[PDB]
């Protein structure tokens with residue numbers, strides 16, 4: 187079981203806080219997206235391209251179940267994983283840190299468009315708020331710890347999580 191499972195919208199800091207929290211804890215980081223494309227040689231985006239969310243999520247939920255079981259480090263859940271009820275069920279009892287980010291800051295951190303398909307450019311701010319409106323309640327469902335990453339620099343979010351694990 188992971189030291190901590192990180193959930194949040196794109197830009198909330200999963201990959202970042204994950205890497206830093208993993209390092210701090212001396213443990214490894216496991217990003218389910220990477221765990222997904224590695225295990226498939228075919229990229230997340232391109233995966234969707236060929237088989238769509240219905241399939242992606244099936245693959246994703248299965249890697250998550252796996253990571254939740256065999257990973258003792260820090261696990262960063264790909265943003266939409268929470269939408270799969272089986273991902274939510276798999277999460278129960280685990281240490282789930284919901285990295286909270288406002289839509290304004292969130293739209294801005296992901297400003298570079300470092301992938302994030304559902305977050306395509308044409309009217310991203312609107313897109314991100316809708317996305318936040320939909321995923322937000324779910325992250326709050328599965329979260330055992332909510333961390334506001336809005337003001338806090340990465341180090342402080344990480345120390346905040348450490349201080350609380």
Ligand SMILES: Nc1ncnc2c1ncn2[C@@H]1O[C@H](COP(=O)(O)OP(=O)(O)O)[C@@H](O)[C@H]1O
Nearest residue numbers: 195196197198199200201202295335338339340
């Ligand atoms: N607390 C933070 N303060 C400032 N920038 C952050 C913070 N958390 C993450 N970032 C930055 O925002 C960008 C998105 O972070 P990332 O970890 O890739 O998000 P996610 O994987 O959750 O989608 C990264 O450049 C990262 O450096």
Ligand SMILES: O=C(O)C1C=C(O)[C@@H](O)[C@H](O)C1
Nearest residue numbers: 219230263264265266303304
């Ligand atoms: O918020 C989301 O649905 C997504 C979050 C990331 O994990 C991407 O890899 C997924 O493809 C999409």
Ligand SMILES: [Cl-]
Nearest residue numbers: 251252255276
């Ligand atoms: Cl299981």
Ligand SMILES: [Cl-]
Nearest residue numbers: 196264265266
């Ligand atoms: Cl994501």
Ligand SMILES: [Mg+2]
Nearest residue numbers: 200201217262
């Ligand atoms: Mg990520």
